[model samples]
Target: DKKQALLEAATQAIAQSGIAASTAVIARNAGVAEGTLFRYFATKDELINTLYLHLYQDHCQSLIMELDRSITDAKMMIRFTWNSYISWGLNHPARHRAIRQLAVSEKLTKETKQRIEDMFPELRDILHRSVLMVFMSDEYSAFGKGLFYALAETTMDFAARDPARAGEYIALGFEAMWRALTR
Candidate 1:
C-alpha cells in the first residue's frame, strides 16, 4: 500500500499547502524516498492528476450511491443530489479543495481531462433525466448546463464562506435549479 500511502501523503500535503507541494515534501511525508516517488508517478503533474481523478471518481460514486432511485419526484431528487453534494464537500473538505484546485490547473493533460469526463456518465444521465422530467420539454434545455454550473459555483462559494449557512445556500441552489429548469 505504498502507493496508497503516497497518495494519502500527497493529499495531506496539497490540502495543507495547496498544489504547490514539492515532491521531496510529499515523499518525506509519506516516509518514502524522494527517488521512489517517481517510480510510482512519472511526474508531479501526473501524480496530482491521478489524485484528482481518484477523488472525483470517489465523490461521484458516493453521490450516486446515496441517490434514492425509488424517489420518483424530480424536485425531490434534485434536493437530494444537492444535499448529498454539499455534505460530501463538507465532510471531505481537504479532498474536495484539492480536487477543485487540480480541476482548474493548467497541468492537467487532455487525456486526463477526458478520463475525468468519462468517469461520471451515470451522474450526467441522472441529471439529464431529472431536468427533462422537471422541464417536460426540450426547448431551453441547453440552458440547464450553464444554470447548473452557476448554481454549483455560487452554492459552493457560499458554503465555503459561511459553513454554518451551507444548508441554506444548498437549498437556495436547489430552488434556483428547479426554477431554471422549469418555468
Candidate 2:
C-alpha cells in the first residue's frame, strides 16, 4: 500500500509543519522516491486534497454509527459524538493535527469541501441537529462552532501531556462544553 504509506507519511509531515510540509520530505518519510509521490498525486495540492478526503472519511466513518437513530436524546447524542471525537484525536494526534492544518490549508479547494460535504450528509445532519445550532444567540452565534473546537483542542492538548489524567480531562472538557452551550 504505497499510496496508503504516502498518506500516512504526509500526515506525519503535515502534523509537524502544517501545509508547508514538502513532497520530498513526505516521499522520503514514506520510503518512496520523490517521483513516485507525483505518480500517485500529480501536484502538491492534489496530495494535500487527497489526504484531506482520506482523513475526513476515516474520521467521520469512525463516528457515523454513534449518531444512529437509536440515540434519541439530543444531549446524549452530542456527548457521544464529543467523546468519540476527543478519543479519536488523542489516538491519532498526528492525523488530528494534520487535519487541522488541512482544514485551513490554502491547497484545499472549495470544491473539495463541497465534495466532502456531499459525501458525508449524515455528518452534516449530525451537526445540524446538535447543540451547535441550538444556541443561535447573536452573542455566541458568530463563533460557536469555532469556540467548541478550540475548547476540544485545548482539552486534548492538556490530556496528551498527562495520560493518567486523560479521562479526567475528557470529562472536564465535556462539562465545559455542556455549560457553555447550555448557558
Candidate 3:
C-alpha cells in the first residue's frame, strides 16, 4: 500500500538525512507526491512518529528473535545480547540510523514510547539481571543501562566505518562494557 511505501521511503530518507528531512524529499524518495504523504499521515510529525514506532518494533523483534533463552548466566547472556545488538545494527544500517534519529528526537508520543517499552519485557529483564549481578545495587541499574547503550552506539559507529576490523571493535567494545559492569 502507499502508506507502507511511504514508510519504507521515509526510512531511507530519514536514515540518510535525519528527522530534518523535508516531506518533499521523502515524497520524492517514495515516488509519491508530497500531498499524498499527508493524505496517509495528516502531518509530518505524525509520519515521523509513526516511523519511530515502526522502526523500534523492527529492532525489538530482531533482538527478541536472536535472544538465547537457555543462557541463564547473567554475564554470558548479556554478552550474547550485546553481540546480537551490534550485529543487527551492522546488518540493518538504514533502520539503525533512522531509529537513532527517532530515538534522540522529541517527536514520539508518550503512548508510542510506552508501547515500545512493553514490546520487549524479557530483554529488559535480562539486562536488569545482568546489572544486578555486576553491581549488586539497584541504584546503579539505570546508570548501567545508560552505559551499555552509549558504548554500543559508539562501537556500532566505529565498526560500521571500519568493516575490515569490525570484529576487533566489537570485542573491544564488549571488553569495555564488561569492565564497566564489573568495576
Candidate 4:
C-alpha cells in the first residue's frame, strides 16, 4: 500500500518538479512517513528510476494501443497516432513532461532503459513504422525524420493548446508531412 501510494505521489511530484524532488517532500505529498519512502525505494536513484518507468508505462501504453487499432490508409494512421499522442500529452502535461525529462536525462539507468525496449518492442516497431509508412520514400526516410519530428512537435503543441483549432490543422499537419516526402 505504501509503495503504491508513494509511486503515485512520486509520479506527480517528479512530473511537476524533477528528480531533485526531495524524499521528505515526496513523503509529505504521499501522506506517508519519511522512513516509509525508503522502504519502497532504498535510494533516491531507485525512486527516480522506478517512477520513470511507471510514468512511461502509464502514458506510452495508451498511444501504443491506439496505434495498434489505428490501421488504415497511411495518412489516416499517421493522423490517428498524432491525435492520440497530442491528446495524451496535452491532457497529462505533467506526466508527459516527466516522461520526456526522464527519457532525455542521464538519471534513467541503462538497465531500466533496456528493460523498456525489451518489454515494449512492439510499441517501438509500430511507432517507427507509422512514421516511415507515412513518408514511404527511402530518400526522405534518412533526412526526412528530422523534418517530421520538428513539424510534428510544433503541430502537437499547437493542437494541445488550441484544440478548438484542431479539426482544421490536424489533417493539415499530415498533409504537410506528405508533401515533405513527395517533394
Best-matching candidate per TM-score: 2
Every model's Cα RMSD, please? 5.7, 3.9, 4.2, 5.8
Return the lDDT, model 2, position 26: 97
What's the TM-score of each model vs. the native?
0.70, 0.79, 0.76, 0.67
Q: How well is each residue in 10-67 modelled by candidate 3, as lDDT tens digits?
A: 8998888878989998888889999998898888778877998888787678677767
Candidate 1 TM-score, true structure as reference:
0.70
Q: Which stretches of candidate 3 lie over 4 Å from their true place?
A: 128-150, 177-183
The full ranking of all candidates by lDDT, starting with the best, is: 2, 3, 1, 4
Clashes of each: 0, 0, 0, 0
Using TM-score as the measure, what is the rank order of every candidate, best first? Answer: 2, 3, 1, 4
Q: Score residue 135 of candidate 1 by CA lDDT.
A: 41
- Which residue runs of candidate 1 sit more than 4 Å off their true CA positions? 68-79, 126-166, 173-183
Judge candidate 4 against the unseen true structure and give its global Cα lDDT, from 0 to 1. 0.67
Expressed as tens digits, the lDDT of each residue in 1-183 for candidate 4 is 888889877777777777677899889999989998888898888877787788768856776666665446645655665566556666766666556556555566768866665555654454455554644354443245446545566677778778789756667776786576432
State the displacement of the C-alpha of residue 171, model 3, in Å, after optimal TM-score superposition. Answer: 2.3
- Candidate 1 — worst ten consecutive residues by lDDT sum? 134-143
List of clashing residue pairs for candidate 4: none
Give the winner by lDDT: 1 or 3.
Answer: 3
Residue 72 displacement in candidate 1 (angstroms): 6.0
